[PDB]
Design a protein around this ligand. Structure first.
Ligand SMILES: Cc1nc(-c2ccccc2)[nH]c1CCN1C(=O)c2ccccc2C1=O
Ligand SMILES: [Mg+2]
Ligand SMILES: [Zn+2]
Length: 313
């Protein structure tokens, strides 16, 4: 009960910042996450024994893939922590609880392949879940881990609060399907501008949480340039393996997944910042002003990719 996690000074300070990198020491990641839950949620939010056992079972159900791995889970959870800490009063007790866990669980049992490759392969998951295939799996896996003996971290919620939190986690995880992001942001864009956006309206809150999830999920583009550039290598390592597997099915992959088109990465990054990342952090900053450092860092990284194309790096 009186048992806080404490980080070294450099981490205690930098963890509060949006651009924090959780470092290469895997064995510190569980304690970093508990630390973030304790400060975000409270030392009483979760029985520490049950939380520690949930965290180690989540870790075991992430695979050794170049990008969609345990490091990503904790990185996405830290971005959510930074958003919640800069927006203290906008979120309920249940939401602070549910979202950090949602982020930790959001890519459980990822195989390093997109929804499209599952459909073209005719994977069994694509017959069980026709849309948002992997994201319905990540939620399924999250519920399975919650129901292991000694793993139910929500045990001390009422029946209605329990159902509310699983509903928050389900929507938060489905929202990480980037195919749903385009329409969610446009609806939020219209609502913010026409002035109809109402945070007491549950369907509006749902949309805002969806965009927060996209923002945390993409947060590699909000790090300092050296972190962003080295993460890009892991992202392409997965995509190019998927492209290889497309060629094995007799299907030309899109250029993003074709290792032969490595040369086009800098221009592919520009499209991605302009079509996906910048709009995401712009709409999020309009709705949640204190998240502006995410937009600022994303713009700095756009400018670094522009330098790459001009042969200045
Ligand atoms: C859209 C896109 N097209 C190309 C490209 C095109 C042609 C040739 C080579 C590359 N690259 C990209 C961006 C790659 N990318 C994602 O897709 C993504 C998703 C979530 C987080 C970070 C990322 C990220 O970096
Ligand atoms: Mg995902
Ligand atoms: Zn993810």
């Amino acid at each position: 009960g009186l048992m806080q996690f404490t980080l070294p000074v450099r981490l205690c300070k930098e963890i509060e910042l949006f651009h924090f990198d959780i470092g290469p020491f895997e064995n510190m990641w569980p304690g970093i996450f508990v630390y973030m839950v304790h400060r975000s949620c409270g030392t009483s939010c979760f029985e520490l024994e049950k939380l520690c056992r949930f965290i180690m079972s989540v870790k075991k159900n992430y695979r050794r893939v170049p990008y969609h791995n345990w490091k990503h889970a904790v990185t996405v959870a830290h971005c959510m922590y930074a958003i919640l800490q800069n927006n203290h009063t906008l979120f309920t007790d249940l939401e602070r609880k549910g979202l950090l866990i949602a982020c930790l669980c959001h890519d459980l049992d990822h195989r390093g392949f997109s929804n499209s490759y599952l459909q073209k392969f005719d994977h069994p998951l694509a017959a069980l879940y026709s849309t948002s295939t992997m994201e319905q799996h990540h939620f399924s896996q999250t519920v399975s881990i919650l129901q292991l003996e000694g793993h139910n971290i929500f045990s001390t919620l009422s029946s209605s609060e329990y159902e509310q939190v699983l509903e928050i986690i389900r929507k938060a995880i489905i929202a990480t399907d980037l195919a749903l992001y385009f329409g969610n942001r446009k609806q939020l864009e219209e609502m913010y501008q026409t002035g109809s956006l109402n945070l007491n309206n549950q369907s509006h809150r749902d949309r805002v949480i969806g965009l927060m999830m996209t923002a945390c999920d993409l947060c590699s583009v909000t790090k300092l340039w050296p972190v962003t550039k080295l993460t890009a290598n892991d992202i392409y390592a997965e995509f190019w393996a998927e492209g290889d597997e497309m060629k094995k099915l007799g299907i030309q992959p899109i250029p993003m997944m074709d290792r032969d088109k490595k040369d086009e990465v800098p221009q592919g990054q520009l499209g991605f910042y302009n079509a996906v990342a910048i709009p995401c952090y712009t709409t999020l900053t309009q709705i949640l002003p204190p998240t502006e450092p995410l937009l600022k860092a994303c713009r700095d990284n756009l400018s670094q990719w522009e330098k790459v194309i001009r042969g200045e790096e």
